[PDB]
Design a protein around this ligand. Structure first.
Ligand SMILES: Nc1ncnc2c1ncn2[C@@H]1O[C@H](COP(=O)(O)OP(=O)(O)O)[C@@H](O)[C@H]1O
Ligand SMILES: [Ca+2]
Ligand SMILES: [Ca+2]
Ligand SMILES: [Mg+2]
Lengths: 364, 123
């Protein structure tokens, strides 16, 4: 029974190979007692609940591990609190970013074998996992999550590292931006549940405009785009153009005072860094992945932006599976379930002789 | 991979066809070749004998309109793995029901046929 762990910038997704969905999804947050031994750690929602008396760390805010004691706490919580397994009994598949530093892959491997005593483990690139989950071996993955977005071109099963672009905003930025534009509209979010309220407004009411200026006009001229939202305390507020302006920052990072290219352009640019002969296949298999690609309208608008950018006879297909919040996780579950996968794992035995660098020869 | 079927694959000129059944690669009876369950995904290897003595490989993964996510995902993956196994020598093709390349359709002398149903998801 293999386990599948997707270490997300914001959210950790964890589960059992063979299941169609993660059994556990929790925030990648570690909480430590501000003032020690006057009255230890907490992970996930419990750390959030108790944040008033905790110092909270985010050990992977941009997809890469910045703190190994806190990452270890996250894994301990994943194993013991969330999945309730003994880790020494399960092969474990873990995901990483495409450009995960070489020392990080080795550290992750070391921790699994030495700290959690896993009998087997494997590290997989997230974008390749989403591609697989979509039933493809070639395509470009546009993954936008919580603290990190990337475009990863993949040809016949393997990412093209030289063509990977790290797009500069994600979910957090969009939540921050939804808060600011709601404040400006007249509203005030002052409780400790402010982030959460605005995140939820983002998740339930935001959409991506097919033609943004025409939407701005429709909205300035009528009331047919507006939506009511009921706050925790029963107060009802109205969400107008904020619904589409917020995710628009994905296409116009300038809204956030950012010089960076938007998601359609980052996508283009990646395709352009690839052998000319494979680009047609990239354009015809643009796969959307991650929470921040969940906005309604996002596929149409990507189709539109990339049509505009590519020669007019280019066949553009955008693939936005409804389950794309978990595409990475689901790719991992399918991979780790395959009859041919027992040969792929780094075993304990292999670890004990090669040590942690075995990862660069086993996992790519 | 020590999968018995990888050991059988690309050994001589020919067509081989496997069905994804529950995260496994299961060979299709040669008498049923060309009859595709639209609720299934399959891996097809076409080995052609070249003038040099070496064999050419084209690997097609065929996706039924109703195959489950685990089956289409496994077909794509098995394809990558079989290609790695054949020293990267296979050209990989994604074949979708109703949109198969002429090359793929060409493999089937009495024309390929669709039939409803298949093996259940492995999830
Ligand atoms: N329906 C939705 N619409 C817009 N954003 C969403 C939706 N559901 C989740 N999100 C956002 O997705 C981000 C997390 O997605 P995820 O892919 O789990 O990130 P990561 O893997 O980087 O941790 C969060 O910012 C969350 O607010
Ligand atoms: Ca089936
Ligand atoms: Ca190949
Ligand atoms: Mg992610």
């Amino acid at each position: 029974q293999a386990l599948v762990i997707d270490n997300g910038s914001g959210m950790c997704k964890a589960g059992f190979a063979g299941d169609d969905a993660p059994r556990a999804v929790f925030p990648s947050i570690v909480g430590r007692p501000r003032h020690t031994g006057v009255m230890d750690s907490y992970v996930g929602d419990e750390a959030q609940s108790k944040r008033g008396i905790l110092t909270l760390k985010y050990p992977i805010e941009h997809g890469i591990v910045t703190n190994w004691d806190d990452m270890e706490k996250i894994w301990h919580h994943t194993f013991y609190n969330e999945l309730r397994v003994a880790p020494e009994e399960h092969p474990v598949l873990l995901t990483e970013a495409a450009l995960n530093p070489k020392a990080n892959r080795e550290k992750m491997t070391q921790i699994m074998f030495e700290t959690f005593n896993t009998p087997a483990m494997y590290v997989a690139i997230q974008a390749v996992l989403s591609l697989y989950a979509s039933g493809r071996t070639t395509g470009i993955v546009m993954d936008s999550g919580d603290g990190v977005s990337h475009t990863v071109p993949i040809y016949e099963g393997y990412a093209l590292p030289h063509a990977i672009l790290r797009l500069d905003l994600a979910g957090r930025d969009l939540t921050d931006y939804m808060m600011k534009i709601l404040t400006e509209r007249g509203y005030s979010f002052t409780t400790t549940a402010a982030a959460a309220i605005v995140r939820d407004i983002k998740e339930k009411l935001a959409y991506v405009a097919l033609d943004f200026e025409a939407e701005m006009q429709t909205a300035a001229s009528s009331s047919a785009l507006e939506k009511s939202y009921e706050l925790p305390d029963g107060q009802v507020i109205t969400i107008g153009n904020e619904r589409f302006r917020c995710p628009e920052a994905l296409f116009q990072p300038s809204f956030l005072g950012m010089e960076s290219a938007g998601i359609h352009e980052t996508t283009y640019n990646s395709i352009m860094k690839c052998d000319v002969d494979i680009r047609k296949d990239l354009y015809g298999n643009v796969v959307l992945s991650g929470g921040t690609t969940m906005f309604p309208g996002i596929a149409d608008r990507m189709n539109k932006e990339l049509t505009a950018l590519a020669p007019s006879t280019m066949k553009i297909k955008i693939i936005a599976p409804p389950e794309r919040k978990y595409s990475v996780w689901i790719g991992g579950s399918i991979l780790a379930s395959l009859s041919t996968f027992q040969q792929m794992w780094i075993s304990k035995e292999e670890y004990d002789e090669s040590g942690p660098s075995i990862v660069h020869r086993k996992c790519f | 991979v020590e999968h018995p079927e990888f050991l059988k694959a690309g050994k001589e000129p020919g067509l081989q066809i496997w069905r994804v059944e529950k995260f496994d690669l299961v060979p299709v009876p040669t008498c049923l070749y060309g009859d595709f369950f639209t609720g299934d995904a399959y891996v097809i290897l076409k080995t052609v004998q070249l003038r040099n003595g070496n064999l050419q490989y084209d690997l097609h993964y065929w996706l039924g309109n109703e195959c489950s996510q685990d089956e289409s995902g496994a077909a794509a993956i098995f394809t990558v793995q079989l290609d790695d196994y054949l020293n990267g020598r296979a050209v990989q093709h994604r074949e979708v029901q109703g949109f198969e390349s002429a090359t793929f359709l060409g493999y089937f002398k009495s024309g390929l046929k669709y039939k409803k149903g298949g093996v259940a998801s492995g999830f």
